Subunit: 201 residues, 4 copies
């Protein structure tokens, strides 16, 4: 694409995109063009507005584009072309990416006892409501736990809410604890955009 | 994919998909799986139901899957696996495609005079509310008008409603009428799915 | 999108797109922009050319854009902006859709006998090498056979060639022949972008 | 989808996916299914093999699925279902994501003088050949530089190679240096995956 300013916009929150080089108030020779999940290629939006788009994105008196509540389908490219009073043309190019922050990750099915030297299901962690999906990771006593390295295995599941499109992640951790290891370890789960079992030697 | 029955479902209308080989009423060992625009890969739906999916797709007492009002995001694949009382397993595989019928095509601008032997903007036709987009075609006196053949030019535009996702099509027709041709032709516009005629005077 | 000329281009064949209003030979103030399966949003192509794109799409001496062999990934939007010697700017907007014609449909597993009043597997039809997929339909004595109407059922399968992306369609027809019907019917299969069994009364 | 093991596979490199619970050598009752950028929904692959898929993915004597050189189109879901000699069925579910590591980021244009208290183009950084695209970040004296915070502005561009599909990123950094700040700062550019520093003189 072209050189653009990258914008991250939280779903459900308003977004104001500035049309650089536009006169401060009408009359303004400016045009907004957008290509998002809502459009077939480019859609042109004007200061006059009108129609269904007025519910989604409106040009403000200062020529900025206003979205009252951003959604997943507003991901895409937004462009303004304006002429000032001198006659100089100025372009504004935005690449808009949307996100949502999930609830705190929760442990839903933890083991109270592990046996050293064999594989053990440690627990299951769930994170609800992210966008984009993100990932869950496990930690042992503050250090990251790396799957497929050192008797650690992890299985993961992603589901989508059928109306909001937000993701739920579920992650299952299995470990083979090392002989003569910590008898009261602490496992934790974190989301990237406290399980304390007894270990039996 | 696998061999499936193709289903075309009108947006906004209910859809019932049969689970073949399931007992006529509970208890039933059956499971529905769907992969649509609503899902991340396969989603499993059970006779027990529950949760947000109950607003979208529910298993009925006879084991059929019911969607009260189909939407664009319900396009995809739907599968049932059931065991009868004997123990025979039966699979049902559906490929669901959704559609919407637009309003009647309308001419929104039209020429009242054409000049033979030069290019003329004849008119503009608009169709609102289709899914998938579909296409607009022009006709001259009942015969199809073919772009790039015989001095015919067409330009077309597709727009999407920002909330419903339904398509609006706009088509502009230009023609170079042939000398000594019909002085009162009839141009019409028609819509063809994706799975007031114009009567100007021509000046020789 | 904008008002454009719709172009259908056969896969594997060249495509020439005219830049309207460009001078007949260099020097020309023109620019091509394309958004296809090959691009991240718009890509700009110039008369100077250069780089990997020279293998895919090149601006010709008359300012037209030339693709030596169109592929599936060249589906999208193509635009030219040119200035003539007077200084008038002219835009050319193309919407390019690609296709491939499959081989003739073939019957691969036909019944020689049907029994009236019960369901019968009549046969299987296969079409290889289309793009986009297209559909197969069945006909009885020249009239279309409509699934789910009048004891007709059809199952369909679509597969994609793992390297070319072209589609293979397979279609299975079952019918319940009507009592006192034609004892030597003719079923045929057609592709949209001769099975002659004996029927036992 | 279902619970799966997530696999990250480097483009161009082989990939072996194990079919858990299969007999160690033929005869084996096992079946692989994959849904990737190469397939229309599920494709079934068998120990017998054959056809164009033999160039892309093959079942090995131990029942593992082998891809000699992974590509972007092999992203997707891979599943094995096998029966052992007892008759126990075991499923293997893999979610495969592909990646490519770009070349080292390079500064392609850079300022040799900045003026404190006004905006300055500092430089342009380029990274070629990543998949997925990834992002470029700027740093000042080892600390991350945050766009829109403290007179910092960044513009970025992503392009795709027309044949390989790998991404090239270009990032332009502008800063307004603070009065009485460091007169010999060090700006650097770094690449972060998607799953020669600049040392100008500053004029107060
Ligand atoms: O002449 C006009 C009058 C009104 C609006 C307008 O929109 C643009 C402004 C600047 C650049 C491009 C387009 C141009
Ligand atoms: O034993 C059960 C219990 C509940 C549901 C179920 O659903 C299936 C039926 C047949 C095949 C696969 C799945 C099977
Ligand atoms: O309008 C709706 C909305 C959701 C589900 C629904 O389907 C049932 C209704 C009653 C009982 C059983 C199924 C109908
Ligand atoms: O001034 C120039 C010089 C060279 C090429 C050029 O490319 C365009 C031509 C017309 C319109 C827009 C862009 C513009
Ligand atoms: O009987 C067979 C013969 C060949 C392959 C096969 O593959 C599966 C094994 C277990 C479960 C599902 C499929 C099963
Ligand atoms: O380079 C390749 C290309 C295709 C398949 C392949 O995998 C096998 C090779 C030999 C024997 C068995 C499997 C290796
Ligand atoms: Cl899901
Ligand atoms: Cl649109
Ligand atoms: Cl396939
Ligand atoms: Cl690009």
């Amino acid at each position: 694409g072209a050189m653009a300013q990258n914008i991250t916009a939280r779903i459900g929150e308003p977004l104001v995109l500035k049309c650089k080089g536009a006169p401060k108030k009408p009359p303004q020779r400016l045009e907004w063009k957008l290509n998002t999940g809502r459009t077939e290629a480019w859609k042109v939006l004007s200061p006059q507005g009108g129609g269904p788009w007025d519910s989604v994105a409106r040009v403000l008196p200062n020529g900025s584009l206003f979205l009252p509540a951003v959604g997943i389908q507003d991901e895409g490219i937004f462009r303004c072309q304006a002429m000032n009073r001198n006659g100089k043309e100025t372009k504004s190019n935005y690449r808009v990416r949307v996100y949502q922050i999930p609830g705190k990750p929760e442990i839903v099915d933890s083991a109270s006892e592990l046996t050293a030297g064999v594989p053990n299901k440690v627990g299951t962690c769930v994170s609800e409501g992210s966008y984009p999906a993100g990932t869950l990771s496990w930690h042992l006593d503050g250090k990251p736990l790396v799957p497929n390295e050192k008797g650690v295995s992890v299985k993961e599941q992603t589901r989508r809410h059928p109306e909001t499109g937000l993701f739920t992640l579920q992650s299952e951790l299995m470990v083979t604890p090392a002989r003569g290891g910590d008898p009261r370890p602490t496992f934790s789960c974190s989301f990237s955009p406290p399980i304390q079992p007894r270990v039996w030697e």
